[PDB]
Amino acid sequence: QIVLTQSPGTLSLSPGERATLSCRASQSVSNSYLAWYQQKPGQAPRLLIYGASSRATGIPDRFSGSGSGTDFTLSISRLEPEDFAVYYCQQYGTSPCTFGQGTKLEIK
Amino acid sequence: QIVLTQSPGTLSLSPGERATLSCRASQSVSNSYLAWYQQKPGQAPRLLIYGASSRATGIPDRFSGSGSGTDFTLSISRLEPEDFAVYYCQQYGTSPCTFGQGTKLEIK
Amino acid sequence: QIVLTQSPGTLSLSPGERATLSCRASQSVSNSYLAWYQQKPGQAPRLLIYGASSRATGIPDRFSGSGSGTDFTLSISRLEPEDFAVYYCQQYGTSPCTFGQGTKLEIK
Amino acid sequence: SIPLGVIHNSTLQVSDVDKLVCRDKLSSTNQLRSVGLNLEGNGVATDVPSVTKRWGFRSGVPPKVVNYEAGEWAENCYNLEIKKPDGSECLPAAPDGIRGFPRCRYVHKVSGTGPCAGDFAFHKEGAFFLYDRLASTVIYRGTTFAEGVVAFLILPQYYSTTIRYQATGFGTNETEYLFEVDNLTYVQLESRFTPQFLLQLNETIYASGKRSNTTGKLIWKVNPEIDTT
Amino acid sequence: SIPLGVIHNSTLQVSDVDKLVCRDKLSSTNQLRSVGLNLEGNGVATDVPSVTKRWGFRSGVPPKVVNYEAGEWAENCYNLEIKKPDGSECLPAAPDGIRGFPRCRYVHKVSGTGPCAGDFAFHKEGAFFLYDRLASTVIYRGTTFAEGVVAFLILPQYYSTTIRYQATGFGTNETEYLFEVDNLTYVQLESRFTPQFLLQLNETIYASGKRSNTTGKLIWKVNPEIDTT
Amino acid sequence: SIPLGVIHNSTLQVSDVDKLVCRDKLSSTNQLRSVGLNLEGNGVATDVPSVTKRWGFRSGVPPKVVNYEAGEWAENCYNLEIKKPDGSECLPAAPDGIRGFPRCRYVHKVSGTGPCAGDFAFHKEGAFFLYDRLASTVIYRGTTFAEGVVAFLILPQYYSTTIRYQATGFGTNETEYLFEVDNLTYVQLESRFTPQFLLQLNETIYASGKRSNTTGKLIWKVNPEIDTT
Amino acid sequence: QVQLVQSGAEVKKPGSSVKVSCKASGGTFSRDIFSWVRQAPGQGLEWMGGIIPIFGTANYAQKFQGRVTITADKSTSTVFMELSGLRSEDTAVYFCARGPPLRGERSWFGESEKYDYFYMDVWGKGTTVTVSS
Amino acid sequence: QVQLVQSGAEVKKPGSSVKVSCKASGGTFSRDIFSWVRQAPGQGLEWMGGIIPIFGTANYAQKFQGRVTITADKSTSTVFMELSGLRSEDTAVYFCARGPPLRGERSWFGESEKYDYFYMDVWGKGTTVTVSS
Amino acid sequence: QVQLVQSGAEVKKPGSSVKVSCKASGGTFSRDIFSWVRQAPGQGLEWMGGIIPIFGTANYAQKFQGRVTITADKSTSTVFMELSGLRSEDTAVYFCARGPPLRGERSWFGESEKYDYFYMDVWGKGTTVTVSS
Amino acid sequence: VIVNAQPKCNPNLHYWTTQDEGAAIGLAWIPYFGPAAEGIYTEGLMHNQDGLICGLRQLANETTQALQLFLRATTELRTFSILNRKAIDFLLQRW
Amino acid sequence: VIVNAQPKCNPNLHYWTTQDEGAAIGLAWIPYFGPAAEGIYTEGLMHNQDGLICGLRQLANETTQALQLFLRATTELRTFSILNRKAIDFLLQRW
Amino acid sequence: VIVNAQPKCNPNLHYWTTQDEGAAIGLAWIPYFGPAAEGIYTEGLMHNQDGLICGLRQLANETTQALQLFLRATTELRTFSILNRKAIDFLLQRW
Ligand SMILES: *[C@@H]1O[C@H](CO)[C@@H](O[C@@H]2O[C@H](CO)[C@@H](O[C@@H]3O[C@H](CO[C@H]4O[C@H](CO)[C@@H](O)[C@H](O)[C@@H]4O)[C@@H](O)[C@H](O[C@H]4O[C@H](CO)[C@@H](O)[C@H](O)[C@@H]4O)[C@@H]3O)[C@H](O)[C@H]2NC(C)=O)[C@H](O)[C@H]1NC(C)=O
Ligand SMILES: *[C@@H]1O[C@H](CO)[C@@H](O[C@@H]2O[C@H](CO)[C@@H](O[C@@H]3O[C@H](CO[C@H]4O[C@H](CO)[C@@H](O)[C@H](O)[C@@H]4O)[C@@H](O)[C@H](O[C@H]4O[C@H](CO)[C@@H](O)[C@H](O)[C@@H]4O)[C@@H]3O)[C@H](O)[C@H]2NC(C)=O)[C@H](O)[C@H]1NC(C)=O
Ligand SMILES: *[C@@H]1O[C@H](CO)[C@@H](O[C@@H]2O[C@H](CO)[C@@H](O[C@@H]3O[C@H](CO[C@H]4O[C@H](CO)[C@@H](O)[C@H](O)[C@@H]4O)[C@@H](O)[C@H](O[C@H]4O[C@H](CO)[C@@H](O)[C@H](O)[C@@H]4O)[C@@H]3O)[C@H](O)[C@H]2NC(C)=O)[C@H](O)[C@H]1NC(C)=O
Ligand SMILES: *[C@@H]1O[C@H](CO)[C@@H](O[C@@H]2O[C@H](CO)[C@@H](O)[C@H](O)[C@H]2NC(C)=O)[C@H](O)[C@H]1NC(C)=O
Ligand SMILES: *[C@@H]1O[C@H](CO)[C@@H](O[C@@H]2O[C@H](CO)[C@@H](O)[C@H](O)[C@H]2NC(C)=O)[C@H](O)[C@H]1NC(C)=O
Ligand SMILES: *[C@@H]1O[C@H](CO)[C@@H](O[C@@H]2O[C@H](CO)[C@@H](O)[C@H](O)[C@H]2NC(C)=O)[C@H](O)[C@H]1NC(C)=O
Ligand SMILES: *[C@@H]1O[C@H](CO)[C@@H](O)[C@H](O)[C@H]1NC(C)=O
Ligand SMILES: *[C@@H]1O[C@H](CO)[C@@H](O)[C@H](O)[C@H]1NC(C)=O
Ligand SMILES: *[C@@H]1O[C@H](CO)[C@@H](O)[C@H](O)[C@H]1NC(C)=O
Ligand SMILES: *[C@@H]1O[C@H](CO)[C@@H](O)[C@H](O)[C@H]1NC(C)=O
Ligand SMILES: *[C@@H]1O[C@H](CO)[C@@H](O)[C@H](O)[C@H]1NC(C)=O
Ligand SMILES: *[C@@H]1O[C@H](CO)[C@@H](O)[C@H](O)[C@H]1NC(C)=O
């Protein structure tokens, strides 16, 4: 079992400020098969990134990220008001799919 | 559900004194289909009156009663020592058959 | 049910001293069908005597006993270090087979 | 010992078993037929209160079945579902291969309870119960049948309705039957009633609306003076 | 390939299959009969310890059945109820239509356990087990049968008792049998015993009262010097 | 109405039913044989994606069975285990007496699910499903069969393998099939594949080791340009 | 005059069921309506359920649905009740009772009679049932 | 663009089971991989189990083995999930989701495609299920 | 000299059952009487039940009726016992034992031998069974 | 020959059978496309020409006794052999 | 013709059959009033007239091999057809 | 007589049957010692001598329609009677 932990619990940043989101695994994720999702209250999470670095369909270029091994990062170059969501990391490199607790971006 | 309530809890009267027994329904009893029974300790209740006013078979003329709607009364013109029983009202006008808690006639 | 009680709880005797073991029944044992067994820690009890007085196969002549009715006794003429075991009486004269709580011989 | 009929033309004779009769001809087995006939064609009473008096239960005798290739249409067919007072079934489930009689004007379906002393219900006059293409010595549960006989002859060179009944004491002499109009509505069944009469009563009752429209049941009794059909 | 016997009168010959034999007559099918005979009529030993050595289990071979119309009376019939050590049944339930052999002087009912390697028990000499009017290649559970053969011939122009046994090792060569007198009372079964002997012992034991009258069981062994019957 | 073939020698004619034909001879019933033939002998396509298009479901029609004494060897036999989406069985268990067809070079075993509207699966061209010595109008669950016909003629005076498939949409027109190599390893099944091709692919995959060695499943798709056999 | 005869007192263990019989005598089943009631000491008398043998059907008070079964057998003139899920709270005198159908509507066909559980004219003596261990 | 359509909110009593449907539309079942997840308020989103309709098989997270059944029927383009042993702790929004197979190894035969539960591109709206009495 | 050989130690979870085998060797089943006993640490040795293979029947001490099953199979010379409803209170050393029939009455027919559970001459080594989770 | 002594006789025989032509369409005979079992019967009426129907009813009435004893004496649950046995006795008596 | 070589032969044939008259009462043939199955058998003794019984036992002993192979080769669970097949071969050989 | 109009015909008949000799050993015929059912078949090849096999395939193809209607019209679940019925019609037409 690969256990994922995300940080910071909440990132307090002004709108327009860069967001950096960390996910760290207890074990390496095979093939760097980690995905990130954006969740709003009342909605299913939307896939943003998969395979550590592949941007998901319909996702704006302001969204990026990379990683390998146990260390994965998601970033937003400018966080728009619309992007102050709860973000989750998930790994699918090793069965079962496992996931982090999620972190929040909040307005400063 | 037609709920029947009887009163007084106990009527304290001398032998030979008239007994008046009340039964009041929460809802009207269709066709005035209410019956009264006389119960002794150790015995099944005996039907005295049915259909509000019809005297049951083998019942002495000292037993009477009447009623309609929600208001029914049983009476005994002279209560004999043999009649100091627990009396119950039952309604059968609307299914299920329902019944009162019963009242007692006691010797004064 | 024939209930057997043995005594003393523990017999404290020096090696080489005679051992006397009592078993008393609440009810007579048919045909004097009572048996005695010698048990060591970690081992199944070995039959010593059956039928009150019949010595079991391979048992040394230092072992004896007798009885009838409700009163049965086992004895060892000289108790060797090897014989400081827990002894039990069992009755088979009346079904179910029943047994005593057992007694211990200990070194003084 | 089974006789055969021989049809010369319109003329029918019972075959003489011992005589050679060079006159008789058989060209193929397609001229040999098993035909089932109903007992109603001999005028036997068919109302429910009378038909059940011809049936009864016996133990220790196994069932037997024969086939037939053709048969007639029945005006009156029966279908039974009888239970013991404790809920046990009285009649055995039909084995596969048994299907109900194919053409009935009316089916008298009788459900109910009664004593059932035997293993199987048998016909008392020795008639057979007719199922799809099979004649049986016993009644099978839930399957429509007609009462009848089988002939064995050598040849010359659909809309239907259901009338339901409910009964008690099915297997005895003193029994009672009710005609079912609705789940809560019944009519006392008399021996003088015909299928047509009961159907007219069913139309009368639904049309007038005089049905049970409460929690209890109503039983209508017929006025003895009104005739039937 | 099945031969037929022909009875001319009292004289019986095996029919010559290839020859025309205009001499032979058949007037109806009522002259053709299937008759079952028992193996006891050929002097085969019938005591329980010997009869079971002719039976055994095989897997991968289905059962077959033929009918017969007549047969003889058996002095010795058998009825088996054998279980595997874990309680599984060894023998299949008989299908409907199978009933026990109709006439037996004695029935040797053997209950017990043993290894049962196959699917069915088959006769080792190729004999058939005879049931009511059916000869079967296999033994069915709980149903009385006789051992025998079927002849196929062209014709010329009840009180019984039960002897119970209990056994272990039913399906093997080294087995043991006890004769049951009462629920707690048994007699060692010897191969020299006849049905008559065992019945005399059953009368002797109840009459003398030497039965188990406790919670355990008693087994009597026969004194080898007392003969049988 | 069933025609018979007559073999005079090597010459075969359909018998004239109405003519006497004193020429024809029958000496015993051993000259009358029921022989089953496979449809593959007439060149009908046999691959799984095509064979199932000839089968379908119907309700309200009972099954029928006839026997045959001899038949040919099949190159391609089928064995079905089809369930409804909720786990209910689509096909009935075979009754006793039914055994699979005795000689098949390959058995195409197809398990899976699909809509099953009827009571039984029937052949759409009216062919029979051939079981051990029985031709049936319906398919029985889990039992190997061949498709075919029965002739009825008058006579003149093993190692096999299994190819498994898994499918969805079994009873409809738009269906999908996979060839099973291992529990987690599949190959898309094409209509152009022969049994020989699939077996060569099974050897290729185990030999190269390109199998699923994880928790998920792999499906190989064939390159359209590589031919078959 | 019709009478109802009940079985004598019984004692059951918690978790079991009690079967109480009531024989119809002094008359026959006819078309009469039968019912069962329960009276725990200090309590009034409650309807448990009932049966109408001519239809061969029965029903129950909601509190006893799933616990009470009522059957009858014409050949012995007897009505039976079984109460399952017994607990000490069930100790009571159980009674069988019988009453008439009521007259209903009339038409040209003939007259109607209504069957449901109404008033009871005939009572049994009562069967005392105790549940304990 | 493929979409998943789920049934509306439901309320169940403790001890019962809830069946939630998810219709595949805007595409067909094809060879896609379907799964179900659960998110109780305040919790992250967990995988419950899933199904791959082309094999007609399904599996479950260990905590739901014996409680969750997942089935599908091609003819109605619908995936169903049933969760048994319901308790108030189960109140959550349940979601269906869909994702692609991944490309695998290549050989001379042809190409391989891998089927397991990976990332989800298409999400349903979610079905709220409450367990109470 | 006859000996009894038992299986080794086992650990079971509460609610399950333990099967303990005992092989008869150094002799055959013959007509001997077999039994099982139990001794929890600090306790005396109690009879649980037993079997007499020649009749193929067995019985049990009342406290184990419904919990203990004893069977035997002649072809492997083995007696088996199964104890169900296991709880930690059941931890004990279980033993198999064997003893002779007793001589009974004599008549002109021949001699009687009596079969019941009497004294045990041959003992196995004992199987330790622990129940825990 | 036939006593014809029943209390009543229905002279009209309204009958059904499965002995139809069957073939017509080319698909008619295929179970998959053919009719449900309740629909495979053909029918018609026969009149009591020269007493044929009443004679027929009496024949079946006399036949019943022989048939029941026949069945009692066998073990087959379903006997489909009676007509073939009759064909065999017919030819044996003649040859 | 018949070797008659068994170690022993029981010359007395005590037999049973169902081929009785049946009819007697008028109710005798009705299953409802008739006897239970154990009672529908009739019996008698036959003596070994001119060797008939011992010849018969040997016939059945030789018949067994052909019969078992016959059954092995078929699919019917219960074969009631052997006697009718024999009637057919009898006439075919003669005609 | 036979149109022989199928699109294709396999001229080689590879066949199996149960009609073997059976006997050989003396135990061969006893079910207890004999072969398992998959082993009771005998086989061989037949060539299309003078068109016999292709004529045979066409016969079976024409036979199917009559056979399906025959079965539709009966109640027997398993019909083993067709060959015996044919033997009976053969002799009746001739006698
Ligand atoms: C072939 O055709 C013959 C033609 O007769 C039928 O055989 C007889 O048919 C007559 C009717 O025509 C039957 O006669 C009746 O017998 C009854 C005998 O009672 C039985 O049942 C009671 C129980 O209810 C038993 O206790 C008793 O022992 C008997 O078993 C009488 O009770 C009947 O009387 C009633 O009807 C007659 C008119 O028919 C009235 O005059 C009377 O007042 C009364 O209302 C009646 O007499 C006769 O029993 C039949 N014979 C046999 C042997 O059963 C065949 O049945 C028919 N074959 C087939 C298959 O249908
Ligand atoms: C029709 O009539 C014939 C007449 O002979 C019967 O056929 C034979 O009958 C004889 C008996 O008369 C059988 O002979 C016996 O064969 C045994 C062979 O052993 C089998 O079983 C063991 C397992 O126990 C296997 O290992 C072995 O391979 C065999 O399968 C012998 O053991 C017997 O010996 C004993 O009896 C003889 C006397 O009969 C004594 O002299 C011996 O000392 C010993 O006590 C015996 O020799 C013979 O086997 C039968 N033939 C066949 C093929 O089985 C037919 O059976 C009968 N038909 C019917 C249906 O009953
Ligand atoms: C005895 O021998 C005869 C010899 O002809 C066989 O009878 C016919 O055989 C031909 C094939 O040679 C069958 O022809 C085919 O009919 C199909 C009709 O469609 C059915 O199924 C669809 C559903 O899929 C239904 O909607 C429709 O209503 C029908 O029920 C056609 O679709 C087929 O076309 C395909 O093949 C032909 C070549 O054969 C190509 O040219 C086409 O382009 C296409 O790919 C085809 O025409 C014919 O149906 C058979 N007759 C009957 C009555 O079924 C007998 O079957 C054979 N007997 C046995 C027992 O096998
Ligand atoms: C008694 O009358 C009712 C009323 O017409 C019949 O019930 C109708 O049956 C038809 C055919 O099945 C249905 O289409 C109608 O909807 C039914 N009507 C009602 C109100 O249920 C009933 O079948 C008749 N009973 C008998 C024995 O003839
Ligand atoms: C052994 O003897 C007993 C004693 O006579 C037989 O049992 C009797 O059987 C008859 C008939 O069934 C009963 O009426 C008696 O009541 C039985 N007596 C007793 C004491 O139970 C027993 O059947 C005989 N056993 C054998 C095999 O013959
Ligand atoms: C596919 O290839 C495998 C590998 O040889 C086959 O499996 C073998 O089957 C034989 C016979 O049953 C066994 O003895 C071997 O042990 C099996 N090998 C393995 C690795 O399991 C398999 O049968 C082939 N499949 C097909 C359809 O031909
Ligand atoms: C039913 O039979 C009994 C005799 O068992 C008799 O007393 C009673 O009167 C009969 N009843 C009817 C309605 O025939
Ligand atoms: C009768 O039963 C049917 C169900 O079979 C039900 O729908 C209908 O409401 C019932 N009618 C009455 C009067 O109870
Ligand atoms: C039983 O067969 C075995 C061989 O499998 C043999 O060793 C043993 O001695 C035989 N026992 C008897 C009683 O024949
Ligand atoms: C034998 O079993 C019967 C029950 O079938 C029982 O009544 C009888 O008391 C038992 N006898 C002994 C000695 O156990
Ligand atoms: C299947 O049949 C339907 C009509 O019911 C049709 O619309 C569809 O295109 C067909 N599919 C295939 C693959 O033939
Ligand atoms: C396939 O199933 C068998 C059991 O039938 C099992 O032993 C084997 O390990 C399984 N293989 C895979 C890849 O799951």
Author numbering:
A (entry chain J), B (entry chain K), C (entry chain L): 1 to 108
D (entry chain B), E (entry chain C), F (entry chain A): 32 to 188, 213 to 284
G (entry chain H), H (entry chain G), I (entry chain I): 1 to 133
J (entry chain E), K (entry chain F), L (entry chain D): 503 to 597
Show passages lifted from the paper.
To determine the structural basis of neutralization and synergy behind glycan cap antibody-based enhancement of base-region-binding antibodies, we solved eight structures of glycan cap antibodies in complex with mucin deleted (ΔMuc) EBOV GP (Makona) and BDBV GPΔMuc. All glycan cap antibodies make contacts exclusively within GP1 and are heavily biased toward heavy-chain (HC) contacts. Antibody contacts are focused on the β17 strand of GP1 from residues 268–280, with the majority of contacts centered around W275, which, when mutated to alanine, abrogates binding. Through molecular mimicry, the CDRH3 or CDRH2 loops of each of the neutralizing glycan cap antibodies characterized in this study bury analogous hydrophobic residues in the cradle, displacing the anchor.
Antibodies exhibited a range of angles of approach to the GP, from obtuse, such as EBOV-437, to nearly parallel to the viral surface, like EBOV-237. Additionally, most glycan cap antibodies make some contact with the inner head domain. These contacts are characterized by hydrogen bonding along the length of β17, with short CDRH2 loops for EBOV-293 and BDBV-43 or extended, long (≥21 amino acids) CDRH3 loops for EBOV-437, BDBV-289, EBOV-442, and EBOV-296, very similar to EBOV-548. The CDRH3 loops of the glycan cap antibodies generally adopt an extended β-hairpin motif with a partial or full β strand secondary structure. These loops also pair with β17 in GP1 to form an extended β sheet and displace the β18-β18′ hairpin by mimicking its structure, as observed in our previous structure of EBOV-548. Notably, we observed that the MLD cradle forms a hydrophobic pocket on the outside of the GP, which is accessed by side chains of the glycan cap antibody CDRH2 or CDRH3 loops. The extent to which contacts are made within this pocket correlates positively with antibody-induced trimer instability as well as synergy with base antibodies. For example, EBOV-548, EBOV-437, and EBOV-442 utilize W108H3, F109H3, and F113H3, respectively, to fully fill this pocket. Notably, however, some cross-reactive antibodies only potently neutralize their autologous virus, such as EBOV-437 and, to a lesser extent, BDBV-43 and BDBV-298. Most of our structures were determined in complex with EBOV-515 to assist with angular sampling and alignment, but we chose not to model EBOV-515 and removed this density from our figures for clarity and to focus on glycan cap antibodies.
